[PDB]
Amino acid sequence: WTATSGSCKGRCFELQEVGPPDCRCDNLCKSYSSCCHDFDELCLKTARGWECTKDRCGEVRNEENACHCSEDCLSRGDCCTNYQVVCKGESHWVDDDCEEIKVPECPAGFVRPPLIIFSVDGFRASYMKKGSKVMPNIEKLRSCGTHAPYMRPVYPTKTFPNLYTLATGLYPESHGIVGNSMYDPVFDASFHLRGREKFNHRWWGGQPLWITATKQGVRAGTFFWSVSIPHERRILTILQWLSLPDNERPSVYAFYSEQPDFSGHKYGPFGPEMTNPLREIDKTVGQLMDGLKQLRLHRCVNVIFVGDHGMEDVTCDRTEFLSNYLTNVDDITLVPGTLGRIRAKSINNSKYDPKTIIAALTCKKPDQHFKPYMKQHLPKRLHYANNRRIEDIHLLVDRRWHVARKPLDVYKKCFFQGDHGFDNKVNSMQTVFVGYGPTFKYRTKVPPFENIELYNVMCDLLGLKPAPNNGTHGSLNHLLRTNTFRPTMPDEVSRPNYPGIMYLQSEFDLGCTCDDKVENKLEELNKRLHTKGSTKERHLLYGRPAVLYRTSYDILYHTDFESGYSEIFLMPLWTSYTISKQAEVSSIPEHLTNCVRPDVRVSPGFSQNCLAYKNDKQMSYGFLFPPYLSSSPEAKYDAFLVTNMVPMYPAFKRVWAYFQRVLVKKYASERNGVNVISGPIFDYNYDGLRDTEDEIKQYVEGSSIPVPTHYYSIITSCLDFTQPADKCDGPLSVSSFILPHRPDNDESCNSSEDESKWVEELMKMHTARVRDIEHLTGLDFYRKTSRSYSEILTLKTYLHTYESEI
Numbered sequence: 011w012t013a014t015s016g017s018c019k020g021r022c023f024e025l026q027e028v029g030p031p032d033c034r035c036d037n038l039c040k041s042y043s044s045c046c047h048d049f050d051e052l053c054l055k056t057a058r059g060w061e062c063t064k065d066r067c068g069e070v071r072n073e074e075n076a077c078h079c080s081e082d083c084l085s086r087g088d089c090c091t092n093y094q095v096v097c098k099g100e101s102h103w104v105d106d107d108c109e110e111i112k113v114p115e116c117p118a119g120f121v122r123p124p125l126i127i128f129s130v131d132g133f134r135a136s137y138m139k140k141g142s143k144v145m146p147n148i149e150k151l152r153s154c155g156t157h158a159p160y161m162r163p164v165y166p167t168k169t170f171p172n173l174y175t176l177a178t179g180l181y182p183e184s185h186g187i188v189g190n191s192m193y194d195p196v197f198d199a200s201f202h203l204r205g206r207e208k209f210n211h212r213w214w215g216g217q218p219l220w221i222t223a224t225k226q227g228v229r230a231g232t233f234f235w236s237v238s239i240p241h242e243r244r245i246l247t248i249l250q251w252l253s254l255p256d257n258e259r260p261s262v263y264a265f266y267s268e269q270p271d272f273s274g275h276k277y278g279p280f281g282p283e284m285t286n287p288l289r290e291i292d293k294t295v296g297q298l299m300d301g302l303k304q305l306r307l308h309r310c311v312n313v314i315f316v317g318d319h320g321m322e323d324v325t326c327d328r329t330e331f332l333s334n335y336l337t338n339v340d341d342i343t344l345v346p347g348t349l350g351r352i353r354a355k356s357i358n359n360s361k362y363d364p365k366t367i368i369a370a371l372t373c374k375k376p377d378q379h380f381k382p383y384m385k386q387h388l389p390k391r392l393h394y395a396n397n398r399r400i401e402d403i404h405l406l407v408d409r410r411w412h413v414a415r416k417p418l419d420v421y422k423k424c425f426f427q428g429d430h431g432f433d434n435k436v437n438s439m440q441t442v443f444v445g446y447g448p449t450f451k452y453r454t455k456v457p458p459f460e461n462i463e464l465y466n467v468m469c470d471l472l473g474l475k476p477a478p479n480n481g482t483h484g485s486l487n488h489l490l491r492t493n494t495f496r497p498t499m500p501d502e503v504s505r506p507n508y509p510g511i512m513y514l515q516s517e518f519d520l521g522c523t524c525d526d527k528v529e530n531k532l533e534e535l536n537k538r539l540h541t542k543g544s545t546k547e548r549h550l551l552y553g554r555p556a557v558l559y560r561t562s563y564d565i566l567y568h569t570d571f572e573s574g575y576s577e578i579f580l581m582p583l584w585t586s587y588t589i590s591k592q593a594e595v596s597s598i599p600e601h602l603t604n605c606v607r608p609d610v611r612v613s614p615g616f617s618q619n620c621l622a623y624k625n626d627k628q629m630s631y632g633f634l635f636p637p638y639l640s641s642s643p644e645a646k647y648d649a650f651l652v653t654n655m656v657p658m659y660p661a662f663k664r665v666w667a668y669f670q671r672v673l674v675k676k677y678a679s680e681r682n683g684v685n686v687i688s689g690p691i692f693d694y695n696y697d698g699l700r701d702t703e704d705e706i707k708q709y710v711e712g713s714s715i716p717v718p719t720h721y722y723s724i725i726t727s728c729l730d731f732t733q734p735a736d737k738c739d740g741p742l743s744v745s746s747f748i749l750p751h752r753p754d755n756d757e758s759c760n761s762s763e764d765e766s767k768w769v770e771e772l773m774k775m776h777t778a779r780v781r782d783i784e785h786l787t788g789l790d791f792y793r794k795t796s797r798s799y800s801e802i803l804t805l806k807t808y809l810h811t812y813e814s815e816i
């Protein structure tokens with residue numbers, strides 16, 4: 011109940027909300043159907059419009075007006091934003107040359123530069139260039155401030171998951187807003203765009219920026235605006251808040267625009283009807299900057315112009331229907347559209363089986379425009395699995411397409427020409443970032459980055475300590491003039507052992523054989539030096555990775571590679587090697603085809619054994635340092651050590667072998683040498699974090715050899731490719747992947763063909779950031795370079811996307 015019989019007199023857009031049955035006057039009251047009777051009359055005045063005119067200059071205050079042009083309005087803080095231009099001969103902010111803002115130039119009583127977040131829905135990265143003629147204010151923010159060519163949203167590329175990621179620094183799987191529509195099975199409750207349940211606090215996890223601010227004594231303007239409040243009124247309210255006394259005035263503010271997303275759905279991303287929404291947005295920015303200028307705040311406030319996601323061309327005809335694949339269509343519930351999430355319609359139906367649903371949806375039609383996954387098999391870069399609200403069965407939908415259950419859904423519920431929600435590496439989904447103000451850099455372009463990074467920077471701008479989040483704090487220090495965050499590298503938790511020769515060949519009963527009993531102090535002194543680490547500077551270019559958890563492991567040196575070998579998991583945590591541009595691929599000799607050799611440095615008890623592989627009819631093995639890339643026939647024997655061996659399904663061996671035989675040499679050729687670090691990953695609970703030993707769900711049959719869920723590789727070289735990878739004086743370049751370790755290649759519909767036709771496509775899909783690998787392995791890479799640590803954090807957050815240029 012709301013007894014709407016109180017009054018909003020003096021309370022218009024009050025900052026502290028009042029609990030019922032007192033009526034509300036806050037900027038969200040409309041949405042709860044709870045405003046005081048006089049809310050519209052008092053708080054939503056429109057009389058005379060939004061702009062001063064020559065005749066209004068000097069006028070007598072008439073409180074009925076939407077904004078004012080009287081002499082007192084500056085002190086009242088409620089002039090129309092164009093007051094000083096019309097009545098005082100000032101220029102519009104957009105007409106003034108830009109001038110570096112080296113320090114905040116704030117009125118007395120401002121304790122810190124305010125932050126204003128200007129968020130625009132559906133603002134596709136390419137609008138900055140393509141719409142530049144009609145967005146002069148935005149273009150000025152962009153060229154004078156700090157900007158990225160694009161900012162990567164999170165998956166799914168929907169509005170609420172992205173706005174709440176902006177606010178929290180968390181992946182949707184952690185913050186809990188995993189789509190625009192959701193079912194939570196613990197609550198037995200549904201979340202929808204339309205309705206009331208979405209305001210229940212239990213949906214919203216983590217700690218959004220306005221709560222972070224408040225808890226640390228920094229006052230926040232309310233972030234949320236009712237759809238019916240006109241943009242001009244939103245701006246005037248923020249400007250009025252900025253005129254409050256010091257003890258009452260917020261330091262952080264947000265504006266939200268429903269455009270261009272609203273018209274983009276209707277007309278598609280580049281429909282001719284899209285020019286006007288882009289003009290109108292620019293005009294709103296203009297009003298803000300003019301109003302800031304009037305208040306002497308245009309060189310004091312930090313302004314962020316940021317989108318939530320882009321917009322793609324999508325029409326009714328481009329829909330895949332599950333009724334064309336499944337006979338059992340009415341026993342499922344589908345969350346439809348630019349992604350698919352499937353669960354059983356009834357938890358009482360015992361005949362429901364996810365495995366037969368997946369099979370019925372896998373590679374069934376020539377150019378099928380969606381791909382089914384169990385959520386734990388989705389590309390790890392999406393970080394989209396660790397939440398009970400995300401259904402076990404997921405469909406990744408091709409850009410430009412929708413998926414739906416039955417045709418009746420699409421014609422009984424063409425309208426739209428645009429939509430979003432696709433894979434967050436898709437170019438059309440990319441959105442914008444511009445920072446302008448004293449704390450941002452001047453005329454500076456920065457590389458694209460992910461929106462999970464912004465929360466940390468917004469905390470930096472306000473002097474706040476960020477709640478724990480998925481940003482890598484420091485990785486965006488290069489956007490900032492001051493207020494950088496200077497982290498220290500994590501401390502190593504486990505120091506390695508350096509074992510020497512401690513076991514005789516006959517102490518090993520592993521069931522392994524090798525044709526290697528073929529026999530010199532010239533080369534005997536040489537091989538001892540290699541085993542002591544004489545070549546380690548060539549193969550370990552950035553220092554050994556640090557182990558950030560408690561475990562027992564050994565460093566093993568070889569001519570061609572160095573490894574950190576886990577006595578607990580019985581395989582390397584990492585293997586590091588360098589392949590120069592000049593290196594040559596050899597084959598595995600015939601006499602060595604099935605060779606596995608005990609490692610005399612590592613006890614039989616801490617070794618894999620070949621018999622388990624023989625007995626395990628499903629599981630085979632591969633090597634982390636590949637025999638193909640051995641530097642010499644003698645060095646090749648090191649590659650067959652039992653300590654270089656890892657469990658691999660034969661289906662996966664196809665992938666791994668092509669990567670090691672073909673692609674590594676190819677990258678060395680193209681990149682002028684590469685350094686490779688490869689290893690296993692164990693994430694059986696799909697939380698994106700390293701499993702402890704007691705979390706492992708699968709072993710090589712009859713043994714304690716744990717089966718990885720994924721294999722990673724990190725491929726590093728010189729950004730200036732005129733220098734070889736092993737002699738690089740400047741910035742690095744990296745690409746990585748986290749390949750799913752799967753017993754079939756069902757994911758790749760063309761896998762019956764030669765590996766040159768499908769393997770690279772699979773690897774591109776499973777591209778990753780080094781940071782993703784860090785979370786998954788508890789390792790910390792790039793510990794010894796000549797680069798600044800912030801630069802290295804930026805490198806670690808880099809994602810190679812394989813999309814063409816924006």
Ligand SMILES: *[C@@H]1O[C@H](CO)[C@@H](O[C@@H]2O[C@H](CO)[C@@H](O[C@@H]3O[C@H](CO[C@H]4O[C@H](CO)[C@@H](O)[C@H](O[C@H]5O[C@H](CO)[C@@H](O)[C@H](O)[C@@H]5O[C@H]5O[C@H](CO)[C@@H](O)[C@H](O)[C@@H]5O)[C@@H]4O)[C@@H](O)[C@H](O[C@H]4O[C@H](CO)[C@@H](O)[C@H](O)[C@@H]4O[C@H]4O[C@H](CO)[C@@H](O)[C@H](O)[C@@H]4O)[C@@H]3O)[C@H](O)[C@H]2NC(C)=O)[C@H](O)[C@H]1NC(C)=O
Nearest residue numbers: 183184185186214215216396397398478479480697698785
């Ligand atoms: C991205 O960044 C985020 C933030 O840093 C990382 O997420 C953190 O990861 C931690 C490790 O997984 C996790 O720590 C756990 O917290 C438990 C208490 O957490 C509550 O309080 C915090 C603090 O306010 C709060 O944030 C949590 O909120 C979560 O849950 C609520 C309600 O469900 C949601 O509204 C909210 O959205 C959020 O959900 C997300 O996280 C949970 C897990 O907490 C997931 O289940 C969800 O799907 C969703 O993703 C909580 O309200 C604490 O109890 C845990 O401790 C248990 O486990 C440890 C293991 O070391 C053990 O030592 C303890 O004894 C304890 O075990 C006992 O309980 C077990 C489970 O019941 C049981 O099996 C045992 O037998 C024991 O009895 C643990 O410390 C931290 O909470 C989250 N934080 C957030 C915000 O998600 C994330 O990992 C980063 N991602 C990547 C890839 O890097």
Ligand SMILES: [Ca+2]
Nearest residue numbers: 693699700701
């Ligand atoms: Ca895990």
Ligand SMILES: [Cl-]
Nearest residue numbers: 168189190191
């Ligand atoms: Cl959704």
Ligand SMILES: [K+]
Nearest residue numbers: 623626627629
């Ligand atoms: K086998």
Ligand code: NA
Nearest residue numbers: 523604605606
């Ligand atoms: Na053998």
Ligand code: NA
Nearest residue numbers: 524525526527
């Ligand atoms: Na032998």
Ligand code: NA
Nearest residue numbers: 755756758761
């Ligand atoms: Na296949």
Ligand SMILES: [Zn+2]
Nearest residue numbers: 132169271275
């Ligand atoms: Zn939209």
